[PDB]
Design a protein around this ligand. Sequence first.
Ligand SMILES: Nc1ncnc2c1ncn2[C@@H]1O[C@H](COP(=O)(O)OP(=O)(O)OP(=O)(O)O)[C@@H](O)[C@H]1O
Ligand SMILES: Nc1ncnc2c1ncn2[C@@H]1O[C@H](COP(=O)(O)OP(=O)(O)OP(=O)(O)O)[C@@H](O)[C@H]1O
Ligand SMILES: Nc1ncnc2c1ncn2[C@@H]1O[C@H](COP(=O)(O)OP(=O)(O)O)[C@@H](O)[C@H]1O
Ligand SMILES: [Mg+2]
Ligand SMILES: [Mg+2]
Ligand SMILES: [Mg+2]
Lengths: 244, 236, 391, 101, 142, 384, 102, 87, 244
Amino acid sequence: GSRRYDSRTTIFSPEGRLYQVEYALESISHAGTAIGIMASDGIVLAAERKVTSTLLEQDTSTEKLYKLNDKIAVAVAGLTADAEILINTARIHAQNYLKTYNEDIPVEILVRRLSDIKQGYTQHGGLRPFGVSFIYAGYDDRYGYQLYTSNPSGNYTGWKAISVGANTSAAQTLLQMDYKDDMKVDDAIELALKTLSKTTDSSALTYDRLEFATIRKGANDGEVYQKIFKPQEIKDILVKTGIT
Amino acid sequence: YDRALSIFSPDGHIFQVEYALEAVKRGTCAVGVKGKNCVVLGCERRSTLKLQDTRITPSKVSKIDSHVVLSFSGLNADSRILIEKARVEAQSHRLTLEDPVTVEYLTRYVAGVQQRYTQSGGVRPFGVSTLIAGFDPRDDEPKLYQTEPSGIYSSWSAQTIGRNSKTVREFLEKNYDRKEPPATVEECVKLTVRSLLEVVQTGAKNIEITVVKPDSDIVALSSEEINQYVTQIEQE
Amino acid sequence: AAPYAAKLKQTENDLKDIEARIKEKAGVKESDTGLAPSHLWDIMGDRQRLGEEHPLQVARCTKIIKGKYVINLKQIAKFVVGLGERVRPKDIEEGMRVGVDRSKYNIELPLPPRIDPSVTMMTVEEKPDVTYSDVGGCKDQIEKLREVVELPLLSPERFATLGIDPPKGILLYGPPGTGKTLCARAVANRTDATFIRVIGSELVQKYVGEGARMVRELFEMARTKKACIIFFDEIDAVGGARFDDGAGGDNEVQRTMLELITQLDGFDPRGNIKVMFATNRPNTLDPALLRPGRIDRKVEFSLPDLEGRANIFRIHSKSMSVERGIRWELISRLCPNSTGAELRSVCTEAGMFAIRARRKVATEKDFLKAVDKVISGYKKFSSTSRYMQYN
Amino acid sequence: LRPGRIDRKIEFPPPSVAARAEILRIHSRKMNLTRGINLRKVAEKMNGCSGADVKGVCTEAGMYALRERRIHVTQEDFELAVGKVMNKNQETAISVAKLFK
Amino acid sequence: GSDREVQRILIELLTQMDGFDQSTNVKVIMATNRADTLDPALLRPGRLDRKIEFPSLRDRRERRLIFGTIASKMSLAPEADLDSLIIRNDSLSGAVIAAIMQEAGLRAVRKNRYVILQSDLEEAYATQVKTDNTVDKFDFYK
Amino acid sequence: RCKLKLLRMERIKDHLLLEEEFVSNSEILKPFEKKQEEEKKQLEEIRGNPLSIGTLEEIIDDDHAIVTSPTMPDYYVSILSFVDKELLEPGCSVLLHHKTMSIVGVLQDDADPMVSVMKMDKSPTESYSDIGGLESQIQEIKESVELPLTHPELYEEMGIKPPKGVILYGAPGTGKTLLAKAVANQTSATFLRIVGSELIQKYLGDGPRLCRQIFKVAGENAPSIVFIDEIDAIGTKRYDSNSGGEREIQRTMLELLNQLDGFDDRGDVKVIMATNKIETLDPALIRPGRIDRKILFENPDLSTKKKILGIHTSKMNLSEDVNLETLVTTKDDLSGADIQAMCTEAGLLALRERRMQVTAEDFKQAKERVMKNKVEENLEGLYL
Amino acid sequence: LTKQIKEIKEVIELPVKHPELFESLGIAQPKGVILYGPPGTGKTLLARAVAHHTDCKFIRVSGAELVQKYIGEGSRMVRELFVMAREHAPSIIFMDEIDSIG
Amino acid sequence: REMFAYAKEHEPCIIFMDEVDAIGGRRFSEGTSADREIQRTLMELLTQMDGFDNLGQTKIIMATNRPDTLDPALLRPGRLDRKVEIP
Amino acid sequence: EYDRGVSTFSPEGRLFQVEYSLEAIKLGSTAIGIATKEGVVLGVEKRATSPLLESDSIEKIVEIDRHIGCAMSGLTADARSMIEHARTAAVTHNLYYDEDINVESLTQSVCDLALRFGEGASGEERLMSRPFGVALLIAGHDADDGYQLFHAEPSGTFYRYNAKAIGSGSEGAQAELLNEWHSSLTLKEAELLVLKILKQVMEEKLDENNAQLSCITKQDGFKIYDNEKTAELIKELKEKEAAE
Ligand SMILES: Nc1ncnc2c1ncn2[C@@H]1O[C@H](COP(=O)(O)OP(=O)(O)OP(=O)(O)O)[C@@H](O)[C@H]1O
Ligand SMILES: Nc1ncnc2c1ncn2[C@@H]1O[C@H](COP(=O)(O)OP(=O)(O)OP(=O)(O)O)[C@@H](O)[C@H]1O
Ligand SMILES: Nc1ncnc2c1ncn2[C@@H]1O[C@H](COP(=O)(O)OP(=O)(O)O)[C@@H](O)[C@H]1O
Ligand SMILES: [Mg+2]
Ligand SMILES: [Mg+2]
Ligand SMILES: [Mg+2]
C-alpha cells in the first residue's frame, strides 16, 4: 500500500475548501497577537511572544521579528518552525531581484511570491501548507508604505491596520475606533501598545515579552531606517504609554 | 508521485470538478456584458471590513494584454497562479507568432492548465472560473468567453458567474439581448452597474468596473465614476 | 397600551379552567364491543360457562409413551396425562398441543401444533382484488409466470402426462418499479390459493435465535397447507449472499439467512409450496438461494418498451376520465426506458393540471407537461434505467 | 448550532485570581482555620484552571489537618496543599494523566 | 425483564448508600478490575468520593518491597539477589511478583532443593513476565 | 385589540356546555329506562369481579381462541357471542371471566407508551399563513396532500388513484418542518409524527419493528398523515457497530417501502418526508408513483422576505423608528429562519434595555449578529 | 463566576416568571441554551441555582439508561420525558452531553 | 459455586474446567443479554480462587483452546501459577 | 474499492472505471452520424442553455484535417486532450509520407491515447490516472476504402460503423437507426435523416442555433454547413412529416 495510507489532504472538501488550509488558521490562533499599523511616516510592527519563562533568555530571542531585506520585515504568527523556511526563501528572492535589476524589491512582488509557495503545497506533492501568517511592513517609493497580511492559503489583503494571532477580533475593534488617517508613527506606537494591553496573554504586559520594531522615514536624506528596539528601549516606550 | 488527487467516479464524473464548481459558487460574482464597441467586466469586491486599504488591495480584474482583460471567481489564491502563467503565454504568442494574443487563444490556454490537472494524478484542478474578454488585433468585434474549472469554455453574449448568478442572469434576460447588444460604452457600463447593485450592493466601495475599448485601449473607471452611475440609476 | 389588553388575559384564563371542568364532569371511558341482534345470549352462555365443562389448560406433548404421555404445561410443570373421552391414540401425535382439564390433567381435546407462532399471525393476509387483465406491462413475461406458478395448480392433468414435477420456484427481478409485485397481486386474486406474505427486515430482532424460530414455524405452516404461495418479499435484507466479517455482528444476521435455505429444501421436499422471491436486485443474492433447483425457471420482468409503455399507459388513461384525441404512442416516444410507475404518475400529475383549470377530464396537453416534470426529476436523482448496475 | 434554535451561548472563563480567591473563601467557611490565614494569599500561589482546583486545595488541606490532628487548619497545610494540586494541575496539562486504569 | 432485575438491584445500592451516610461506620469499600464498567450516577460523589488508583509502574523502592516481603515468606540461599531484579522489569504487578517467587519454588523442586537458588529464581523470572511495548527489553529510547 | 367580545362569546358557550351536561346527568341521564336496566341484568351475570386481561394469540372459528395470559397460564377460551365473534384479531386485549374463562368482552384500545411517541400531545397552532410565502411550493402539498382528503370530489372527477406521498427538501430554514404540521392541523386527520433520529436505535431488529408500527396505525385510521421528520438522519447517524451501523440502515429503509405502499394495499397514507440529503433514500423510493410530485425549496426572494418578516412583526411592538424595508434589503436570497432569528433577537435587545418599544436600532443590531453566524462561524471570513 | 449569572437570568428566569413581557415584545421565548467552558466551573451548579428560584424541578439527565428502567432506551424517552416535565411544571431538563458514553 | 464446595468436602479433588472459551469471555455488553451471564459467572470464580478460600488440596485445571479468549483475571498468575502450553 | 485504483481487476473480471466512462457518454449532447458512399454527414446537438449563450461559435464539430472530420459527445474536458492529439497525428502522417492518413489508422492512434490508464502498468509512460469519458465519431474519406465512419470508445477500442449515435439520447437514437438505415441513401437523404433522429432526442425546438451539420466529401473536403443551410434542411423535414 502506497495509496492505502494516503488520505488526500490536497483535495477540496464538498464546500470547495481545503481541509488543511482551514485547520492551519486554527493553529495560528494559538500563537500570540501580532499587530501591524500603518501610520504615514512608517509602519509599526509589534508582537507579543507566545512563550515566556523566567529562565528563558528573551533579550536575544527572535521569535517574531525577522528582516527579509533592509526595508521589509515580517511579524510571525503561527509556528516559528514553519515560518523559518519561508523566511530564508524570502531572503533569497529579495536579493535575487536586487542582484539582477540593481533595485530593491517592491513589497507587492515579495508578498505574492511567498503566497505562491503556500498555494503550491496544496496544488501538488501531497504536501501540507506551512501554517504561517505574516504581517509585512514594507517600503517602496511607488506606493510609499504598504501593509499586508498573508494567510496560509497564499493570498494577500492590503490593510491600514490589522492583527493576526490570539485575540484577533478584540484587537481589531480597538484599532477601528482609535485610528486617524493623519496618524504619526508616535500615535501608532502608542496605539499598538495599548491594543496589546487588552489582548495580553499573561495578566501583565512586560517589555521583555515584547518585540517591537518600526520602519521610519525620519532617517535623513529620505532613507528608511528599520530599528528593532531592544527590550530595554521597549521599556522606555512602556513607560510612555504608562502601562508601567 | 502521481497519486491521483483527481479520480473517476461511479456516475462517470470526476470528483474534483463537482467540488470545484461549488468552490467557484461560494466565491465572488462576475458579470460580463459586451456591447458593439466595448467589453465590460464588473465584479464583486470583498472590502467589507474597515481599515482595509482598498487601493493597494488586489483587483478583481487584471489585464493580461493591452486589450485583453481577465476577471475571476472562486479561490483567490488559485487565480493569481493562473494570471502569472497567462502572462507567459501572452509573451509566447508574441515570441513565436508575433502579434499580441487573440482572446480565443488565451481562453484555450487557461483551460489547458485546468485540463492538465483533470486527467493526471498528483494534481487537482484549481477552483477557478474566469470571464475572458477583449479585442483581437485589428478587430473591433467584442469577444466574451467563459472558462470553468473543468477545462471547458463557452462563448457568451452575457454571462455571470459567482453568487446569486441566477438573479443577475434573469435580470439580463429582460434587459440584454444577443440580437442587439448596447450600442454605447456608457449604456453597457450602466447595465453592469445596475446588475451588481442587486446582490453585491453597498456602493462603489464594493463595486468595480473595467472597460476595454477596441484596438489597444484599456481604461479603468475610478470609484468616483462608478458612484455617479450608481446615483443616476438609483434615481431612474 | 389599550384598555382591553389588561382584560384579554383574564377571559383567556377563564377558557383554560372551564375546558378542565367540562372534561371532569363528563367523564372518560372505553366501551365494550357489542351486537344489537344480541339481547339474549346467556341461554347458552351458561352451557359454555358456569362450571367445569370447560376452558382448557393448554399443554404440549413432549413424549409419547407406548401403552400415557409426558406433557409440559404452559405453567411450566410436567405431568402424566392420558386419553380422555373423545380421543384416538391416532389423534395424539408428538409435538401436538392438547387441552387438558385444569383440575386433573387428562387429554380433553387435541389441538394443532405449537402456540409459539403468534407473530406469524400478523404475516398471513387476505388477497387483494386485482384483475389479471391489469398487468405491469403486456409481455409474454407474465405468461411464463403463468406456466410456473399458475397452470399446474389448476390442472395437474398436463404435468402428469409430461411426467415432470412442476417447477415451484421463480425469481421476480429487474429494475425497481416495473410492477414486479403488481403482476403477482394480479396472480394472487387469480389462483384462489392462500397467500402468506413475508417481510425480510421483520425477521430480525435483538436476541438471535428468536428469528430462526419465527422463520421455521411459518414455513412448516405452509407445509401443513396445500395450494398456498409463500411470497418472500424484500429478502435483499436477509437472503443476500453470506460473508464472514471477523469482528462484526454480521454473523447474527447470517443466521436467518441459513434458516431460509434449510426450510426450502427440507428433509422432505415441498408439499405444494409455490415460492416467489421478490428481489429489487438480482445482483447480490445468495448462491444458496439462487441455485436452480429451488428457484428453477426464473423470468426477468424487464423495463417496458416503446410499445410496452404505451400498453401500460393505455390502462392508466382508460381508468382516467379523459377526452379523445390522445396519443399514447407519443408518450412512449417522449419517455426513455423508464418505470411504469412513472407512467402511473403522468396521469395523476395531469389530473392536477386538470384541476387548476377546472375540468372533469384530461387531454393530451396535460400529459405533455406531466411527462416533462417526471423526466427532469429523474436527472436530478439516480435510477433512470438502472438495474443498480451489473448482471 | 443552527441559528434559530440557540439564542444564548454562555462561556465559562477559567477563573480570574479575583474569582479564584472567592471560591477558596466559599469552601473555607465550612472549614475551621487558624485566624490570620489569608485565602487571597493562597489564590496567588495557585494559577488553577477550574473552581475544582481550588476546591481541592481546601479538601487536601483539611486532610493534612486530619493527619496532624488539630481542629484548626494550619497555614502550613495551605502551603503544601497548593503544591500538591499544582503538581497535579501541571501533570494533566502535558497530555493528560489517566483517571481510570 | 431479567436485565431489569439487575438494574433494580443497583438502584437499591444507591438508596442504601445514601441512607448509610454521616454515620460512624466506614462508607462502603468496593473494588473493580475494569474502570470502564462504571456509570455517572455511581462514580459521582455522594457514593464514591475517594479514588485510590492502583498502578503497575510504581517506583524502584516500592517494587523493591514486593520482592522482599515475599522473600521473607520463602527460604533462600544467599546467592539469590532480590535487588538486581528490580531494574530488569518495571511493568510488574505484585501478583506477578508472587508468581515469580512461587514458580521459583517449583523450579527448586525439580532439582530437589528446598532453598531457593538463583538458578531457580532467574529461570522462573524470565517466563510469565511477557514482553511488551513499554518494557526495557527493547530500549533505545534513552 | 378589542377581540374581548369574541373571547366572551366563546367563553359563554363553554359555560352553557358545563351547565347542561351536569344537570342532564342528575336524574335525567339513563337511570329510569328498562332497555338499560334489564339489559345490564345478564350483562353482569357473565362478568366479574376480576376481568383478567388476556392476549389474543390466535382465533379458532368455533367460538374459541387460545389466549396466553400475562399471569402465564394459557386458556382455550370460549366467546359468549354478543360481542361479535369475529371483530377481534391477534394483538387484541380480552376480558376473561373470574370463573371459567369466556371472552366476556374485548377492549379496543390499550395505550402503549410506544404509540405515545408518534401520537401528538400538543397542537401545532401555527398553520397556513404563519409559514407564509412559498405560495408556489404549497400547491404541491395542498393539491396533493391536504386537498384530496378535504375534497375527494375533485379526484372522483378525473378518476384514477389520488396522489400518494411527497418529499420536501431544500436549504435549512425554509419552513419545511412546520409546513407538514400546518396542513395536518387544518385537516384534523390522524397526525403521526416520528423523528428521523428515533428510527436509529442502539438496539437491532426492533428498529424496523418500530417503523412497521407507525403505518399500521395509519392504515387503521382512514384519514392519515404521517410526518417523518428528518430522514437524512439515517445516513449520518449511527451508534455502536453491532446494532446500529450499515446493517440497521439497510433494514429500516426496506421496511419502509413495504409500509408506504409495497405489497400491503393499506389505507390511504400521505407521507411527508423532510430531508435535505436525498441520496440516503432508496432508488425504489425516489421514483414517483409512491411520492408523486417532488418539492424543491430555494431560499425565499426579497418580496417573499417581506411576507416572512410580516408574520414576525405583528407580534413585535412597533415604533416610528422602525424601518422594515431596509431589513429586507441587506438580506439577499437568505433563509426564513434568519428573519425569524433576527426578530427574536431584536426582542432580546429590547429586553436588555428594559423597554417595550422595539425600534429599527434593535433590529439592525440583531441583523448583524444573524449574519455573524455566516461570516464568523466561517473562520476564513471573506472568501479566501 | 458572577458574570454567568446575569446572562442566564435574562433568558431562563424571565420567561418562566413573566411570560407576559415576552408575549408583547414578540420574542419567541428562548429555546436551547448552551453552557460551556472547563469541567469544574459549576455549569451544573448554575443550572441548579436557577431551578430553586424559578421553582422548577431540577431533572439532571446524563444520557443515561440507568434512570430508565421502564422504557430502557433514550429514543422513546423523549416524548414521555417531556410529558413528565409538563405534569411537574415548571421544569428544567439539564441534558448535559458529555459525549463519552459508550 | 456448589461444585467447589462439594470438591472441598472431598479429599484431594481434581477440578477440570473443560473447553472454557465462552464461559470465560471479557466485559463485552454491547452484545446481547447473554454476555452478562458470562460476566456474573466469572466473578464467582475470582472470589473462590482467592478470598478466604485458598486451595491447597483441591486443585484447579483449566483447559482452553486459545488463551486470549480469556479475561485477564483468568490470565492472572497467583490463581493460575503455571501456564503450561501443550504444543 | 476498485475505483480507488486506476489499474485493478474487479470480481466481475473487467475494469469498473471504464464502465463509468460509458456512463459519461450519457451526459453528452447527442451526436448523430450517418455514413453512405456519397459522403458522410455528422450532426451534433449544441445544446442552448440560455438566450444569453452565443451558440453559433460553439460547436461539437471539429476538423482533425482536410479529409477527416470528427464529432465528439460526452465529457468535453477529456475531449480536448484527444482532439489535440488527433490533430498532431494527422499532421505527423503528412510530414512523414506526404500522404493522406487512413480513417482507420487515424482512429487507431487515438485509441492508443485512450489506453493510458494506470500509473505503474507496463513500460509506456502514463500521463493519466484513469480513463477518458468521451467517445468519438471520426468520419472521413480515404482513397482506399472510400468513405468511412468509426466510433471510438474511451476504452481504447474502436468499431467501424455505418451509422452511430452517441450522447445522452443514444439508445433512443439507435432504435431509429436500425429501421431507417439502408444502402440506397443519398447524401441529402442522409442529411435529413440526421435531423429526424435528432429531433426526438432534442429537448427544445429543433432549430439552427442548437444544431450543426457538417459533411466530409472527397471533392469539397471537410465543409461545415452554415446555419442558413441547417435552417433550410430543418424546414423540409417538417414537410416530410406533412406527408404522414
Ligand atoms: N407497470 C405499472 N402499472 C401500473 N402501476 C404500476 C406499474 N408499476 C408500478 N406501479 C405502481 O407502483 C406501485 C408499487 O410498485 P411495486 O410494489 O409493484 O414494485 P416492484 O416492481 O416490486 O419494485 P421495487 O424493487 O421498487 O420493490 C404499484 O402498486 C403501482 O401503483
Ligand atoms: N415562510 C416562513 N414564514 C415564517 N416563519 C418561517 C418561514 N420559513 C421558515 N420560518 C421559521 O424558520 C424556522 C426553521 O424552519 P422549520 O423548522 O420550519 O424547517 P427547516 O427548513 O427544516 O429548518 P431547520 O430544521 O434547520 O430549523 C422556524 O422557526 C420557522 O417558523
Ligand atoms: N463558580 C464556582 N463557585 C464556587 N465553587 C465552584 C464554582 N464552580 C465550581 N466550584 C467548585 O468546584 C467543584 C467542581 O465543579 P462541578 O460542579 O463539578 O463543575 P461542572 O458542573 O462544570 O461539571 C464544585 O463541587 C464546587 O465546590
Ligand atoms: Mg418489493
Ligand atoms: Mg426543523
Ligand atoms: Mg458538566
